[PDB]
Amino acid sequence: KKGVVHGVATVAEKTKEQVTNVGGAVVTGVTAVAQKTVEGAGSIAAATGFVKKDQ
Amino acid sequence: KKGVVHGVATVAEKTKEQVTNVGGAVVTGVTAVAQKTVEGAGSIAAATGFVKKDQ
Amino acid sequence: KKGVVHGVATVAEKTKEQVTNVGGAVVTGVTAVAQKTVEGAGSIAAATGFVKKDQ
Amino acid sequence: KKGVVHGVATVAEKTKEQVTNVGGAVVTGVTAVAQKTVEGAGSIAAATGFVKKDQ
Amino acid sequence: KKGVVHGVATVAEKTKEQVTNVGGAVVTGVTAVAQKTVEGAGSIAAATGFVKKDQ
Amino acid sequence: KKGVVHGVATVAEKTKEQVTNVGGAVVTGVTAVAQKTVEGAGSIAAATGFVKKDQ
Amino acid sequence: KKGVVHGVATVAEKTKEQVTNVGGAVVTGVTAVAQKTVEGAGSIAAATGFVKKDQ
Amino acid sequence: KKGVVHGVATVAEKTKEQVTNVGGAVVTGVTAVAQKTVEGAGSIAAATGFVKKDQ
Amino acid sequence: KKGVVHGVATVAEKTKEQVTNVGGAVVTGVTAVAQKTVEGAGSIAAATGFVKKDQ
Amino acid sequence: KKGVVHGVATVAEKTKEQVTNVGGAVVTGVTAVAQKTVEGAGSIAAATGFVKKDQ
């Protein structure tokens, strides 16, 4: 076989899960957050996949 | 087989899940948030997939 | 076989999970956060995959 | 076979898990955080994969 | 076979797990944090994979 | 002060929450269930407060 | 002060939370269940407070 | 002071939390369950407070 | 002071938490379960407080 | 002071935590279970407080 990509690719066979991202956010997984009190200014309480590039 | 992509591709066979994103947000997964009190200015309480690029 | 990529690629066969990211955040895994009180200004309480590049 | 990459690639066969990242965050693994009280200003309480490059 | 990379590559066969990172954070492994009280300003309580390059 | 009860009482002062039960069920708390597929005959999928006394 | 109870009592002062139960179930706390597939006959998947006295 | 109980009592002062139970189940605490697949016949997957007295 | 109990009592002053149980189950504490696959017939996967008296 | 109990009592002053149990299960403590695969028939995977008296 032959393949040429510029990116971003994701090429496969017999594949149970696939995610391609440029951005941006993708949530595909099981996630449970239980929480009782959030205070403070300002605290990232429960972050799973996170990116902060403030300018 | 032969394939040429510019991106972003996601090419496969026999594949249970697929996500392609440029952006942007995609939520495809099970997610449960239970929460009782959020305060503060300003706190990211429960973030799963998150991207902040303020300018 | 033959392959030429510019990146970012992810090329495979017989592959159960795949993630390609440029960004950005991708959450595909099982995650449970149980939490009772968050205070302080400002404290990253429970971070799993995290990136902070403030300017 | 033949392959030429610019990076970042991840090329394989018969492969159970794959992650490619430039960024950014990717969470694909099982993670359990149980927590009772977070205080202080500001303390990284429970960080699993973490990167802080404040300028 | 023949291969030329610029990096960062990860090239393999018959491979159970793969991670490629430039960044950034990747969490793919089992992780359990149980915690009862975090105080102090500011103390990295429980860090698994961590990088701090404040300027 | 003086108090005589037969039960079930719940006597207090300055008290944020109170529940008295004989029965029976009382749900006063925050609860989030997210769920994707339930099968089997017959499986208690997600039970929070539960009592089964079949005769 | 003086108090005589038969039970079940719960007597207090300056008290943030109170539960009295004879039964029966009481749910007053924060609870998050995220779930993707339940099978089998019959499996208690996620039980928090649970009592089974089948006869 | 003077007190005579038959049980079950719970007598106090200046008390943040109180639970009295005869039964039965009481859930007052923070709880997060994240789960991806439950199979088998029949397996208690994730039990927190549990009592099984089948006859 | 004077006290006579038959049991089960729990008598106190200046007390942050109290639990009285006859039964039965009481869950008042922070609990996080993250889980990816449960199989087998039948395996107690993750049990925190547990009692099995099958007859 | 004077006290006569039949049991089970728990009598105190200035006391941060209290548990009285006859049964039965009580979970009041911080607990984190992260888990990736459970198999076998039948294996107690992760048990914290456990009692099995099958007849």
Swiss-Prot record, chains A, B, C, D, E, F, G, H, I, J:
It comes from the Eukaryota. Highly expressed in presynaptic terminals in the central nervous system. Expressed principally in brain. Signal peptide: none annotated. Sequence repeats lie at residues 1-12, 13-23. Phosphorylated, predominantly on serine residues. Phosphorylation by CK1 appears to occur on residues distinct from the residue phosphorylated by other kinases. The modification Phosphoserine is found at residue 43. Cu cation binds at residue 6. Belongs to the synuclein family. Neuronal protein that plays several roles in synaptic activity such as regulation of synaptic vesicle trafficking and subsequent neurotransmitter release. Participates as a monomer in synaptic vesicle exocytosis by enhancing vesicle priming, fusion and dilation of exocytotic fusion pores. Mechanistically, acts by increasing local Ca(2+) release from microdomains which is essential for the enhancement of ATP-induced exocytosis. The 'non A-beta component of Alzheimer disease amyloid plaque' domain (NAC domain) is involved in fibrils formation. The middle hydrophobic region forms the core of the filaments. The C-terminus may regulate aggregation and determine the diameter of the filaments. Soluble monomer. Homotetramer. A dynamic intracellular population of tetramers and monomers coexists normally and the tetramer plays an essential role in maintaining homeostasis. Interacts with UCHL1. Interacts with phospholipase D and histones. Interacts (via N-terminus) with synphilin-1/SNCAIP; this interaction promotes formation of SNCA inclusions in the cytoplasm. Interacts with CALM1. Interacts with STXBP1; this interaction controls SNCA self-replicating aggregation. Interacts with SNARE components VAMP2 and SNAP25; these interactions allows SNARE complex assembly and integrity. This is Alpha-synuclein. It comes from Homo sapiens. The gene is SNCA.
